[PDB]
């Protein structure tokens, strides 16, 4: 390339700023990139499921696990019942219990 | 329920231990009727049984393998521990096993 | 007041053990470390050192300010200010890539300019003239002992 | 220092005596005798009645305040048995009945048992900051009876609900399950039971007459199944020396301000056992009750007496700590959770904490808190001044973020503050919004350090004064050399040289390079070629835009070739076929030098002459008069400042060394 | 610090400079910033 085109390329590349957003009242960073259509569709569906599951499903899953542990006279670990509420962890629920 | 004790006392106590149909495993060094008399499963001094054990009894004796077993038993978090108080070892151990 | 014996290994003991405060500090640090994963004596003595911090200091003679250099000619000499030379090396290399280094160097320079001038005179040395009392040349902020013979 | 502040000294010593009569157990020495003079001069560098808000306005600092409080106020102690001389006696006297209590008793602790017991006691010292959770290993084998007895004793040892808690919901539910399991282990004769419709634990009735033991099920709205059952625990009295710790906490509703009193939960528990039909442990608890009561009374005393400082939680925080935990979303206060075993509860029940010696750092706490407050105020004013300075000069100071400012201001600080803030920010995170909220807060602690920093920032507003400049130029010049042919002429004359400019160059005949232009040239590989091309025309190039640091040196012999051939930038060739051909560092070490050659060194000319002629590149124009050629006739013109001093018999004093010396 | 010490050369390098013309589109690898004086010559 020439001088003007390379300068324009660098100016365009330096303009990809990073914005701060929220997911389940937790901080995330969002930016702009390029990807194909179906791959982006699958990724967006996965992100939407991750956002949607955080509200109701996994809390009921943890409660049901605790109830089963209460019935079977077995006490579960402290992590699997209290890391639910920890701030700096996102718990993706791939297997609804 | 099972215990760890040095082999010296168990070698002497084996007759009354077998009388109570308690399982026995040692390593040498050279009127109302009930179901079972005692809840003890077995008494052993082997290092392999510390992972399954739930209590141990210490006593001043001579045994080349008691140091490591006692230390590994003490390593566990919530395990029962009993100590000798002098006097007669035989009656103390018999009372401890029967009243357990 | 002696503690009740406890079993370690296969023998009883009655040792006092470590201090409760040291145990609390080290266990709290262990909890923080295991949280962030996925020496307490140093911080205790550093708290003790911070307890005795001093902001100013007392001096006997003011720090030297100006100095002179001969020029091999009697008519003129060279006068330089020791403050600029002394304050020149206190900083650090500055790169636009990391603004934190730049602002840390600026803060360090401000701390230096604060700390250099924090002094209090207590009792200056002085000599007696024929009728009055005059301070010694050492208490002044100018050194010219090496230019007098020429 | 010239001002008069005697009233401040009277207020400070009044605060001393206020804390002294509040803490009359250990503080006795008072220093009014020295203050009643008129000869010596005191300095009030620090102010004693520190505003508490300044240590709580900083975001996410609960962990740091807690750890420093426990470092500066926690005493040491020992653990004793409920009855001594039981090690020597035979266990035949110790065990006489049958049951989980009989099988458990007569045991001997290990090191881990004592560690867990002291952890339980430490958790009991702090009502809300420290919470307990059960440590469960999936791969272990354990007798049921220890779990049974641990549940039935931990249902009584700790407290829950009411106004404050030191338990999680997990341990509450586990203890309820263990109590339910214990109540239905039938070793003695049979007792009639009646179960309820729903299936939560404890929902049944026992005894010949039915007893609703489902009230014993844990609930944090009121705290029915523990020590907080319908008993007042927090109260208020005559105002404390600290304006944020007006509360007084008591566990069992008792106060020595009397032997043989009980409370509601213990009587209810004893009635529950006597309804259950097990009298052995009933008589056991009946005998052991006074030891339990006295240990809670004296741990109440040590909690209310020693741990009262500025680092304690404020009243609003203490009140709001529990509803935030119930809701499930922590806002500003985050307790830390401590693991513990099963058997630990019973062995902590039998033992009692017996403090023997106090912390040796208790006497010097006010100095530490005042220093901490002053340091935080200094950080605030540094934040404000850096923000204003960045706003003042946009073209020569680069834009930044509050996080970079915080890192820079925390790097240069006493390392106690650095360590505690690092621990606090590692435990809980921060954000830009919190930093902005902190910086617009108006709380400040007046101090000598604050005024000194403010006036120094006022004196340092000139960027050109502090050896930061952008007037750097590159130009090819011939370095002059001494003639050296005539020794008498070399002695008569002299060699003086510098790279200093008496005036900046012309407006024209010069170009300007910024960062991005040089970066583009370096990426394209046309930087040095362009510099050589523009130097061939005998012009100057200025590296403006970003402030640089300049060193200054003096020399007599020839200086090393580094300072003669110094370059403002550094060039580094990168790997082939990358994003750019080479990278540049736009600012490196830049030295101005003054060459004043010694005359006698002409006797050995190897220290003067070079081999071939050379060129010097860098040039700096600075407006200050750093080096001046002055006639001797005016050399006394510098004497124009007025100084004041004291006498030898005069003595300066400060309250810090007076307070730390003790008796 | 009999004023100074000299040692004879550790090694002298005989170089042949053949600049590739392909590098002509990318300067600063074939050009200097000042006229430069070379000293060492070796006769074989």
From TrEMBL, chain B:
Pfam families: Orbi_VP6. It is found in: Virion. It comes from the Viruses. This is VP6. It comes from Bluetongue virus.
TrEMBL record, chain E:
It is found in: Virion. It comes from the Viruses. This is VP3. It comes from Bluetongue virus 1.
């Amino acid at each position: 390339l020439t001088a003007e085109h390379r300068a324009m390329i660098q100016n365009a590349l330096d303009g990809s700023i990073i914005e701060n957003g929220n997911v389940a009242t937790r901080d995330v960073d969002v930016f702009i990139g390029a990807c194909s259509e179906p791959v982006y569709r699958i990724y967006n569906r996965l992100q939407g499921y991750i956002e949607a599951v955080q509200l109701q499903e996994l809390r009921n899953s943890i409660g049901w696990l605790e109830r089963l542990g209460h019935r079977k006279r077995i006490t579960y670990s402290q992590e699997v019942l209290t890391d639910f509420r920890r701030q700096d962890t996102i718990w993706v629920l791939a297997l609804q219990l | 329920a099972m215990l760890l004790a040095p082999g010296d006392v168990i070698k002497r106590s084996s007759e009354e231990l077998k009388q109570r149909q308690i399982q026995i495993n040692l390593i040498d060094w050279t009127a109302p009727i009930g179901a079972r008399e005692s809840a003890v499963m077995l008494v052993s001094n082997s290092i392999k049984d510390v992972v399954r054990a739930t209590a141990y009894f210490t006593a001043p004796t001579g045994d080349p393998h008691w140091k490591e077993v006692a230390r590994e038993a003490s390593k566990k978090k919530n395990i029962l521990a009993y100590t000798s108080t002098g006097g007669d070892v035989k009656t103390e151990f018999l009372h401890l096993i029967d009243h357990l | 007041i002696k503690t009740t014996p406890y079993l370690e290994g296969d023998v009883l003991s009655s040792d006092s053990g470590p201090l409760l405060s040291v145990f609390a500090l080290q266990e709290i640090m262990q909890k923080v470390r295991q949280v962030q994963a996925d020496d307490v004596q140093k911080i205790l003595d550093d708290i003790k050192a911070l307890a005795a911090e001093q902001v100013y200091k007392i001096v006997k003679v003011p720090s030297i300010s100006f100095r002179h250099i001969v020029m091999q000619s009697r008519d003129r000499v060279l006068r330089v200010d020791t403050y600029y030379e002394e304050m020149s090396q206190v900083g650090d290399v500055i790169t636009e890539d990391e603004p934190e280094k730049f602002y840390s160097t600026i803060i360090k320079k401000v701390r230096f300019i604060r700390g250099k001038g924090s002094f209090i005179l207590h009792d200056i040395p002085t000599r007696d003239h024929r009728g009055m009392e005059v301070a010694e040349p050492e208490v002044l902020g100018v050194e010219f002992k090496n230019v007098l013979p020429v | 220092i010239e001002a008069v502040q005697l009233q401040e000294l009277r207020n400070s010593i009044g605060w001393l005596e206020r804390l002294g009569h509040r803490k009359r157990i250990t503080y006795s020495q008072e220093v009014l005798t020295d203050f009643r003079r008129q000869d010596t001069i005191w300095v009030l560098a620090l102010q004693l009645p520190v505003n508490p808000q300044v240590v709580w306005d900083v975001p996410r600092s609960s962990i740091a305040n807690l750890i420093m409080n426990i470092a500066t106020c926690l005493p040491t102690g020992e653990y004793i048995a409920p009855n001594p001389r039981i090690s020597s006696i035979t266990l035949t006297q110790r065990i006489t009945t049958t049951g989980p209590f009989a099988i458990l008793t007569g045991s001997t602790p290990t090191a881990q048992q004592l560690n867990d017991v002291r952890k339980i006691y430490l958790a009991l010292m702090f009502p809300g900051q420290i919470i307990l959770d059960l440590k469960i290993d999936p791969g272990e084998r354990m007798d049921p009876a220890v779990r049974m007895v641990a549940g039935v004793v931990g249902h009584l040892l700790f407290t829950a609900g009411g106004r404050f808690t030191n338990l999680t919901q997990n341990m509450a539910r586990q203890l309820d399950i263990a109590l339910n399991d214990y109540l239905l282990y039938m070793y003695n004769t049979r007792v009639q039971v009646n179960y309820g419709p729903t299936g939560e634990p404890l929902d049944f009735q026992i005894g010949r007459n039915q007893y609703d033991c489902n009230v014993f099920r844990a609930d944090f709205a009121t705290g029915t199944g523990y020590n907080g059952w319908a008993t007042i625990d927090v109260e208020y009295r005559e105002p404390a020396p600290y304006v944020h710790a007006q509360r007084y906490i008591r566990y069992c509703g008792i106060d020595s301000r009397g032997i043989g009193m009980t409370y509601h939960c213990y009587n209810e528990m004893l009635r529950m056992l006597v309804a259950a039909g097990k009298d052995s442990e009933a008589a056991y608890f009946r005998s052991m009750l006074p030891f339990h009561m006295v240990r809670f009374a004296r741990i109440n005393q040590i909690i209310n007496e020693d741990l009262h400082s500025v680092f304690s939680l404020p009243d609003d925080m203490f009140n709001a700590l529990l509803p935030d935990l119930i809701a499930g979303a922590h806002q500003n206060a985050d307790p830390v959770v401590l693991d513990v075993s099963w058997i630990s509860l019973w062995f902590a029940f039998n033992r009692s904490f017996e403090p023997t010696h106090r912390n040796e750092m208790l006497e010097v706490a006010p100095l530490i808190e005042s220093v901490y407050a002053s340091e935080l105020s200094v950080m605030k004013v540094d934040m404000r001044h850096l923000s204003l300075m960045q706003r003042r000069f946009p073209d020569v100071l680069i834009q930044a973020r509050p996080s970079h400012f915080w890192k820079a201001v925390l790097n240069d600080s006493p390392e106690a503050v650095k360590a505690v803030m690092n621990l606090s920010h590692s435990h809980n995170f921060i954000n830009i919004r919190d930093m902005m909220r902190w910086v617009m807060l108006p709380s400040l602690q007046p101090s000598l350090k604050l005024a000194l920093e403010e006036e120094a920032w006022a004196a340092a507003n000139d960027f050109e004064d502090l050896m930061l400049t952008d007037q750097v130029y590159m130009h090819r010049d011939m370095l002059p050399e001494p003639r050296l042919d005539d020794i008498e002429r070399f002695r008569q004359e002299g060699f003086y040289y510098t790279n200093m400019l008496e005036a900046p160059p012309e407006i024209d005949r010069v170009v300007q390079y910024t960062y991005e232009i040089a970066r583009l040239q370096a990426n394209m590989g046309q930087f040095r070629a362009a510099l050589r091309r523009i130097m061939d025309d005998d012009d100057w190039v200025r590296f403006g835009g970003v402030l640089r640091t300049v060193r200054v040196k003096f020399y007599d012999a020839r200086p090393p070739d580094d300072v003669l051939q110094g370059l403002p930038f550094s060039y580094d060739t990168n790997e082939r076929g990358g994003l750019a051909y080479a990278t540049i560092k736009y600012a490196t070490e830049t030295t101005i030098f003054y060459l004043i050659y010694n005359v006698e060194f002409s006797n050995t000319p190897d220290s003067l002459v070079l081999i071939n002629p050379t060129y010097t590149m860098t040039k700096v124009f600075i407006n200050k008069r750093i080096v001046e050629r002055v006639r001797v006739g005016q050399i006394l013109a510098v004497l124009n400042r007025r100084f004041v001093a004291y006498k030898g018999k005069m003595r300066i004093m400060d309250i810090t060394q007076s307070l730390k010396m003790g008796t």
